[PDB]
Symmetry: C5
Subunit: 214 residues, 5 copies
């Protein structure tokens, strides 16, 4: 029937993934000779808890992560005109992007699956709840409290993974309307760290949150 056509479609996809994944061992990840740029952005959904005793604060957000590999690339025409597909994040390489301030291991609130597009670009969007070092003090005043946490590669250097932001403006469109706390400013600024011990740049994306109780 028109049944036959949906099968054809599955097969082009079952075929496309196999060619991508099962016909090379694995992407070793980026190197100084193959570099990689990861674009970060944040949508801040909530500030759930501010804790004066430990000076820890707990956020819920979605971290948009975007990077392009030549190793995932295909002619849609060879594959039934498939321009993209969804797949398990465990089937691909994902950058090691970590907060440098976490006081507790991140918890993942969303299915780990990513979108891969024929030009070789991957867009992964993990929702996470994160506890990090923050001093809430002033959160009950009208000026509020100010906290910052940095994100970047844990193990690579600017020569292998670089970070980039589409905007310095964190996305509040989805922020919880009734959250215990309200948001004055949120911004995401890319920076470069240097260390005396080394000749390389270490990039990070700085999240600054300015909030107070409703």
């Amino acid at each position: 029937k028109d049944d036959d056509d949906k099968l054809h479609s599955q097969a082009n996809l079952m075929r496309l993934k196999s060619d991508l994944f099962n016909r090379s061992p694995m992407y070793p990840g980026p190197t100084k000779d193959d570099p990689l740029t990861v674009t970060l952005g944040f949508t801040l959904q909530d500030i759930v808890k501010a804790d004066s005793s430990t000076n820890e604060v707990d956020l819920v957000y979605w971290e948009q992560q975007r990077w392009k590999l030549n190793s995932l690339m295909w002619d849609p025409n060879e594959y039934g005109n498939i321009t993209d597909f969804r797949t398990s994040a465990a089937d691909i390489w994902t950058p090691d992007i970590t907060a440098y301030s976490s006081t507790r291991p991140v918890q993942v609130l969303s299915p780990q699956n990513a979108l891969v597009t024929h030009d070789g670009s991957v867009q992964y969007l993990p929702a996470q709840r994160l506890s990090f070092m923050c001093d809430p003090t002033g959160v009950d005043s009208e000026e509020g409290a100010t906290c910052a946490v940095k994100f970047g590669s844990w193990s690579y250097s600017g020569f292998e993974i670089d970070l980039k932001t589409d905007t310095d403006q964190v996305d509040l469109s989805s922020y919880y309307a009734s959250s215990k706390y309200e948001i004055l400013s949120a911004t995401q600024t890319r920076q470069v760290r240097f260390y005396e011990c080394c000749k390389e740049p270490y990039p990070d994306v700085n999240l600054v949150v300015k909030f107070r109780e409703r």
Copy 2:
């Protein structure tokens, strides 16, 4: 007994033919869409926390959907109309609560039921913590919080959603719960984010609840 051996063999052969012989289903495509039906059975509201503005639910979430590739003729399979299977042996939809502040906990064995026409019924029971403002939970009107459920990585063109009723199922609601239910609904909506020209469905659970005075 004699025939018991056969029924056994008939089932194993069926699952071999569905799963060993045929590869992993790649999931829905723009050219091979799904529709997942949602319904909720609310069982308890366990805790309301106004420090963090978080509420905890226990419910059963029913998911039903259909794949041709799970389809078979009972007469080659010894009149097997349906069978129960581990959920890991099949593709399941990546359906997530959009406002969860803690990773969902699963309270039930994860197994599903597949019927000869290719339909799957999956009914996971969960504890969810989502963003809710309890204010007014001690008062006659109660409080109103809502949470949405949708695919995380797929748009309406690939995974679509419907409900059987807009009425959430309260027949199992624990009668001594600290909170009593004033109303519970599950409603299907579509949103556009115009970064993209295609629909995003979600099922919206709205619950109004009140401390049980008694």
Copy 3:
């Protein structure tokens, strides 16, 4: 001498296990054409906590389940007079029994291993901590508080898994004598339910507990 003889038992069990399990395809589970019965019963060790705020109660108990598979059947003479063995519960089908009204994922206190006997009967004894839905009002009256939780197949009906008890009363023989909570009465009894929607039976074992604070 007898070291060498003990070495033969070891190879016989190794071989029984190999013949049963990975020389046989994974058992599909019960059918309506191949049904089974699970016998359930509880040994209640502790009432750990009763939360008046969230209305949930934490129990510790060992849950005895038994069932009999024909596929696990064997003749002890072909296998060296081996009548039974301990095995990893991951190595065999186990039933889907679950508490119907828990508020948290159940926690296993015990290694998970099962005993397999040559008639194909299996005994499994998970020790658990369970938070179920409970209103601990009156815990401080001589009348005490009463809560109940049901266990049963989550995905199978009475036509694939029948469910039952050996005795109708929870084993209190191991109950912690210094827990904050005394037990007035503890019950486990089978019930069968039907639904309007569907014509087939759903069995469950209903566990009912009455408890006081310890004076």
Copy 4:
């Protein structure tokens, strides 16, 4: 040259582990025909917490399991004089030894790796935290509180696994000097249980602890 000798010793160890484990099948565990004796002893590090609300107490201890199997036995002469080796607990059979009266799944504080000796004897020293049933009353009394816990096989009778202790003396030499509770006495004693229902013996080691606040 000095290296080759370092290199050659690795080859010898690798060779032995291969002969021992992947060459031979996984040991099924004890039988009534192949009984096994497990030696238990405790080193009590800390009493972390006592909850007089729920009546549970929290210990941090190191448990020393030791046992022996001919299957692990080797002649060091064929192994370049290798007497012993360290390995992960996954690579070998371990007794299923559990606290009978725990209220919480045990948390393992140490890397799980054991020591096998050429006479076929394993020594396993897992560091754990345990929450078990204890009623604290008196802990602020000179007399102190006494609680007690049993350890033994969850699934095996005295006919498959027998228990012993090297000594009856619990080792307090590593106990935390500044712990909230000072230890009064601690004893580890072998017991054997019988049931009317069944003919066979169940041993256990009963750990008894008398403690009070500092």
Copy 5:
């Protein structure tokens, strides 16, 4: 293009890794005849909490670990002038270093990947959160409170793993300034114990922290 050398540099790395990890079976560990020296160092980040009912304090640090394996060496000129690479820590052997006085299974805050360099050296930098045994009494004094915890191999003696520090000074450059507690002193110092049971030495690196509130 220059997508080639990118392609070839990528090809060279996969070849190197397979030549290390798939030529020869995973390495057996150090042995008295193939001993190993691990260098430890600590970057202390935050003291997150001090619980004085249980006497437990919580640290967030990054432990630096280095060791050299002959079996990890290669010749850059055979491998494309590659001088080092980043890899998952699961692919390679790692030492059993742990905290001797922890009260909870330690938590891992960072992606676990290590840096392997051509001379066979590995740098691993786990970020951890540790709850250990600490009597915080005095934390409100001018003097503040002093606590200590030891680190070292769990199963390995000094004959197989030795410990070393580059400096006896913990690295406070990353310490969180708005942290609830101030750091008066921090030292990491090699010690060597003889345990009476066993003939050989067991070194540890003793972490000493003097901190107070404010």
